[PDB]
Amino acid sequence: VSIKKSSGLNFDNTAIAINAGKGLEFDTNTSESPDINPIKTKIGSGIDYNENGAMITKLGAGLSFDNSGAITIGGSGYIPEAPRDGQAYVRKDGEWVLLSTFL
Amino acid sequence: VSIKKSSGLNFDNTAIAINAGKGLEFDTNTSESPDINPIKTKIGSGIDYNENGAMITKLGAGLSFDNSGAITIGGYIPEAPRDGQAYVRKDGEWVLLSTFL
Amino acid sequence: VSIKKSSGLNFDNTAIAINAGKGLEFDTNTSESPDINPIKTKIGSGIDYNENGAMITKLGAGLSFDNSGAITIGGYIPEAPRDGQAYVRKDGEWVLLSTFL
């Protein structure tokens, strides 16, 4: 049987196998293992699978996802830079308000 | 044909198929689908593909890549000096309240 | 040979090949390449391999993994109280503007 070994297949003894490299492995923890093992990705710190088997970033304290599914520091109480106009600012009701309005 | 089923292949009514598990799927949205579907990764929040089809982390406010492509936090505000005096924020720096009183 | 082309295999010059899509590529940088190229994931910025060949998020300054493998922030100032009053920063704490007016 003709296989293309430059395209990820090889012979394991007499038999065609996937030749899995970095980031991939065979799932030996299914119902049908070890006889039948699907190929799956191989993931470590920072990455998880969701309920549908998609890879997502695994976020802990201080990180969240925005509206676009992008990772953001949020989200956290951390305070963004005040406007760079030439005037002094103070913090009022979660916003930057000029010092003038109180002088 | 003999196949190694313990290595990610299986038979689907006589035909050799990839047996795709977690993190992987067939792309049924290509020009040649559904009769010919390549295998691709399966990705969700926090991950995207770039122009070359490589997986990257999808970054939003406050995060960016450094020169080595690591995710970094480095424009949120550092602590003001701890000298005994009140400070306000002027031109991206901490300036004493005195200079305006 | 019968192959299921809707499941990630296709013919290339009558040989069976994996039809690799987004997030996958063949590794042409092995000791047996390009005669033999394993299939691997295709990764870019924000992702790396560890020594076990698992994909990890590539973390730079200000970010670390917690003990459950999640990305977390490792020196920014917290939000001031939301009571209706203006605040200034004094001695590593939020102090009302009133006390200085």
Q: What whole-number distance in Å separates Cα of residue B48 and Cα of residue B59? A: 9
Q: How far, in Å, CA of C97 to CA of B88, rounded?
A: 10
- In this structure, CATH architecture of domain C1-101: Ribbon (2.10)
Is B61 an 8 Å CB contact of chain C? no
Task: Say how far apart CA A35 and CA A12 lie, in whole Å.
Answer: 14
* B4: enclosing H helix or E strand: none
Record: contact C85-A63, CB cut-off 8 A: no
**Interface contact C25, partner A, CB < 8 A:** no
Give me the residue from A8, A55, A97 closest to C86, CB to CB. Answer: A97
Q: Are strands B47-49 and B55-57 parallel, antiparallel or unpaired?
A: antiparallel
- Top-level class of domain A1-74: mainly beta
What is the C-alpha separation between A99 and B100, in angstroms, rounded? 9
- Residue in C51, A16, C88, A71 with CA at minimum distance from that of residue B9: A16
Q: Which of A58, A63, A86, A67 is nearest to A75 (CA)?
A: A63
Alpha-carbon distance of C24 to A23, in angstroms, equals 9
Compute the distance between CA of residue A26 and CA of residue C26 in angstroms, rounded to an integer: 17
Q: Do C90 and B86 touch (CB under 8 A)?
A: yes
Closest chain C C-alpha to A59 CA, distance in angstroms: 5
Q: Kindly tell me the sign of the dihedral angle through the C-alpha atoms of C65, C67, C72, C77.
A: negative
Nearest to A22 by CA among B77, C24, C20, B80: C24
HSE-up of residue A19 (Cα within 13 Å, Cβ side): 25
Domain ranges (residues) in chain C? 1-101
Calculate ∠ Cα C78-C84-C89, nearest 5°.
40
Query: Could A53 and B63 be called an inter-chain contact, meaning their C-beta atoms sit closer than 8 Å?
Result: no
For residues B43 and C21, the answer to whether their CB atoms sit within 8 Å is: no
Identify all chain B residues contacting C91, using CB atoms and an 8 Å cutoff: 82-84
Query: Measured between alpha carbons, how far is C98 from C84 in angstroms, rounded to an integer?
Result: 12
Quick one: which of C70, A87, C88, A49 has its CA closest to B44? A49
Which residues in A lie closer than 8 A to residue C85 (C-beta atoms)? 92
Residues 71-100 of B with CB under 8 A from C: 71-74, 76-80, 82-88, 94, 97
Alpha helices in A2-63 (DSSP H): none
Could you tell me which residues come within 8 angstroms of residue B93 by beta carbon, excluding any fewer than 6 positions away? none
Tell me which chain A residues have a C-beta less than 8 angstroms from the C-beta of C49: 22-23
Strands A88-92 and A71-72 come out as unpaired
DSSP secondary-structure letter at A75? T
C22 Cβ contact partners less than 8 Å away, ≥ 6 residues apart = B27, B40, B41, B49, B53, C42
Q: Would you call B61 helix, strand, or coil by DSSP?
A: coil
Class of domain A77-103: special
**Calpha distance C37→A52 (Å, rounded):** 29
Q: How far apart are CA C86 and CA C64, in angstroms?
A: 34
B31 close to C (CB below 8 A): no
Largest CA distance in chain A: 86
Q: Give the experimental resolution in Å.
A: 1.9
